[PDB]
Symmetry: D2
Subunit: 250 residues, 4 copies
């Protein structure tokens, strides 16, 4: 019987590539999304055309609020209702924008979005995943540049640092239940389509390996390794997939 | 002419020892407290007895909420109200208790553990910088942040976030001449609720002297980081842990 | 045509498991050894019986000395002599024993063995590997066997620990410098895997009980699996990364 | 009065560290390899302030069969002159590129970069501990150790090895009451200055010395195994 995975933020870009590769590997998938319903649905239809009844969508805002714990419990529950099991959780969804310390969202909204998506929702999803429970594992999408932060991204960086701590804390606490918890830390991967090529090229030229950003598929390949039987003794580990970018001095 | 410092959670234990040592160094101090009103007022009385008009208390809950920004702004404002300047912020206040992943609401636990340990330091940092010699912020971090205690996920996430803030704010505020650094205790003053046998278990793990840090030993590192002897140091986190973080399982 | 790999210290234990797994993946292998001549030849025979002319042995002491550079050069040369190419280098060989700071080999012999095998030989083999290279198919990489407990060191193992820290530095320095040549450099960091043969069962079980995931050591094959991942096309954008394979051991406090 | 050994003390950071320890009340052994005139000039300056408080000690810190005996004699020079040795500062350092892809032989570069930067500190640490209050060792580390300079593999390996020695020695010597810590300068030319967050300028040697003074002081009595970056924020700046 086929295993099942939840991927958050799976409608586009990296989470889409993760959902596709997990599906190619034999997993049934819950495609979580927030705003991108048309893209989430189009991915589910493509996957179900490949193998019937192997993909469902689940909508939820992962912003921190009074209701976030119920939302995260519902994402996990949707995997059990669709597929009768939940073997893999991939915490991929992420808000990313600057929050300068010195001078139309209020700062508490920015806190709820950046700390909720990057850290609190992963924690609540992790709680719900474990409470509901073979090769069980969680993969958190971290950031290879977490210790050389972008200027004016403090709340984003705090959320990603918190996710490192969750990855380590959850690996230790869930090891007795046989649940592994690991991370994949991209450097620069898919850049914004709207970003000018001159700016994209500034970033690409910083990468030692190939002077080019990672494809979403290269990020997905590390996720596939971590959930596989080839990683059965790996927990608490964060694999950078960054072409050497984090090793480059200013 | 005397510089002024804010110390959060300064009524007792490590924050008290920091406020006392800054006051001894020449600083005027805002003693922030949440519940420990009698202890905060007693400390301000003791410091004012030594030099009049050099200490005030300021009450605030640093749990995350939609009014936490205004509370954090008010803490910094109280320093400018009392002393006309604010040269040093020490982010010391902290909630600490277990939050098991497998069986207060969980959103209250998030508000308290992430709010005190990370969001309030962030908002206090924003207010400190915006409201602006030798300006600096010192965050009390945790030397054991990468060897977490079992069932302390949300606490550990908050302290990891505080490392991120220390580094991000160091980078961003360097052009304003504000340095941002951390002091990471291992085991210092053990929780009041702790039994004697458990206290001794933790003392025996420490390589250097088989004992916990005094609060004054933690305060000494804070003093160094705010001093002119640390003027080229920013983004650094000094472990004051007697070697504890280097001991394997 | 099949790619070829050098594995150092490959006669037994983890290095043997890595050579076997690379062989099963389709590589031709140089089985480097120092003292374990019988075990090396027995392994090369087993692999040659599976597929003809796909394994050779290569003997070398990797202790530091003025001839270590020539010895490392000759290991790499042996892969090209046997197989016409050298696609992967796995730096696995390692000396491991205590060197207490406060009170038999001289201290300079201990330096030569612990820093030579764990750091200088990997450096020289990396130089010789890269120099011997100098388009749609190439997948060149180096994997260094590191140590997940490098920052929580064992009491009285200073020189061993300095060697493994040096190897982290080489991994990151070589990843940066060789990236322009298309050579990726990564590490695999066991926690406790195959316990030293010298150890009694009680002492082995003390270590087993510390591991969060399963309260047991990693099998040699589990270590080799991470090596296979890093040399594979599934790791084509990964360089300078060190993957812990430690069942959570490095996360456990005192 | 306590006594300190400072290696590579004739110039630059090591000189500033010797001056500041001397100003704090230490007697000092000024180690040198080639800079005898400069070492003696410093000893003359310190001894003019306080008589018989500064001596010099020649040694090559390149790894060789005789390095252990040389390192033992540096520590013994401290005990000879002053009757005690409270502080060891491992400051001496060789620094140059060793490209992996192509006139010292590579094994000479190993002996100099790994020997001066890591093996000499290890042997000096052994001799210091064997010969044994506020005892401590301070190792000059590198704040850029995990974002290495291109083509500096052997230098970087040596500085990584020095982080391992700092941590291993802190653990092993804690029971002896010997603390072991590091100070990691960043940059201590205008291209480099411009990337530094704090003031777009390099660290004075005196700023490095200030962190050493803190770590050997009674204000750091609970601190061991810690490496303090003194780099103006540079290590936090992305490429
Ligand atoms: N791209 C890179 O270079 C890079 C670099 C370092 C780390 N990473 C990490 O890798 C992961 C994937 O990166 P990516 O570039 O693919 O991410 P992305 O496009 O920025 O975001 C992924 C998805 O996150 C979901 N998300 C955002 N805010 C949300 C909210 N409030 N509630 C629920 N879901 C929300 C969105 O879903 P909808 O579209 O459905 O609203 C979005 O499509 C992220 O965790 C990111 O931090 C990426
Ligand atoms: N003690 C140790 O071993 C140790 C080890 C590692 C790190 N640290 C760090 O060092 C710092 C000081 O440690 P400590 O043991 O002295 O701390 P603590 O006694 O646990 O707490 C410090 C103070 O924080 C304040 N606080 C707690 N919740 C708050 C809230 N919701 N709003 C506002 N203030 C609140 C309390 O003030 P009131 O009393 O006024 O309510 C409390 O007295 C902390 O950041 C801690 O994480 C300590
Ligand atoms: N085993 C573990 O739990 C563990 C834990 C952490 C890290 N690691 C790392 O993983 C790697 C493999 O571990 P292992 O236990 O399989 O290693 P090991 O059995 O201790 O040693 C592997 C091989 O190293 C070779 N070697 C030793 N000194 C040498 C010298 N002077 N010249 C040339 N070769 C020399 C030996 O070859 P001959 O037998 O031919 O003489 C030996 O069989 C090592 O790098 C180790 O540091 C292992
Ligand atoms: N300058 C910086 O920006 C910077 C940055 C990062 C780290 N650091 C570290 O901080 C420390 C001091 O830096 P610095 O710039 O003042 O050092 P430096 O001038 O490069 O060298 C310090 C002294 O080391 C001695 N030395 C070199 N090779 C030796 C050998 N084979 N035997 C014995 N002594 C030898 C030399 O003494 P003689 O002159 O007597 O021959 C030299 O004057 C070093 O550990 C360095 O790696 C410095
Ligand atoms: N806008 C910018 O200033 C900026 C900052 C950093 C970069 C390079 N980092 C990434 O592009 C990156 C880094 C993390 C990240 N997380 C997400 N959820 S999307 C995402 C993208 C590109 C543009
Ligand atoms: N409760 C426990 O199980 C427990 C966990 C860790 C320790 C050792 N850590 C500390 O005592 C410690 C660690 C962090 C910390 N943060 C605060 N605000 S108080 C505080 C105390 C002691 C008891
Ligand atoms: C008779 O007992 C022995 O086997 C001796 C060697 C191992 N030993 C230990 O104290 C010790 C330290 C750490 C461990 C856990 N680490 C490993 O087993 C380990 C770690 C690194 C490593 N590198 C190699 N080349 S083999 C190797 C093994 C096990 C034993 C001293 C006594």
């Amino acid at each position: 019987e086929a295993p099942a995975a939840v991927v958050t933020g799976a409608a586009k870009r990296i989470g889409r590539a993760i959902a596709v590769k997990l599906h190619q590997t034999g997993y049934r998938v819950v495609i979580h999304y927030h705003n991108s319903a048309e893209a989430a649905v189009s991915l589910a239809d493509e996957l179900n055309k490949e193998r019937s009844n192997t993909a469902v969508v689940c909508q939820a805002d992962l912003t921190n609020s009074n209701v976030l714990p119920a939302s995260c419990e519902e994402i996990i529950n949707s995997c059990f209702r669709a597929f009768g099991r939940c073997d893999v959780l991939v915490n991929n969804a992420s808000a990313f924008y600057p929050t300068p310390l010195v001078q139309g969202k209020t700062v508490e909204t920015q806190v709820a979005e950046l700390i909720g998506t990057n850290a609190i929702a992963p924690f609540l999803l992790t709680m719900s995943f474990a409470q509901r429970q073979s090769n069980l594992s969680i993969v958190n999408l971290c950031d290879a540049m977490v210790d050389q932060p972008c200027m004016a991204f403090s709340l984003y960086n705090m959320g990603k640092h918190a996710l490192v701590g969750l990855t380590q804390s959850a690996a230790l606490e869930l090891a007795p239940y046989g649940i592994r918890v690991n991370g994949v830390a991209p450097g620069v991967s898919l850049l914004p389509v709207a970003m000018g090529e001159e700016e994209k090229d500034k970033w690409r030229r910083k990468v030692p390996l190939g002077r080019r950003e990672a494809s979403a598929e290269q990020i997905a390949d590390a996720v596939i390794f971590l959930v596989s039987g080839s990683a059965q003794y790996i927990t608490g580990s964060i694999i950078k997939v960054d072409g050497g970018l984090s090793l480059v001095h200013a």
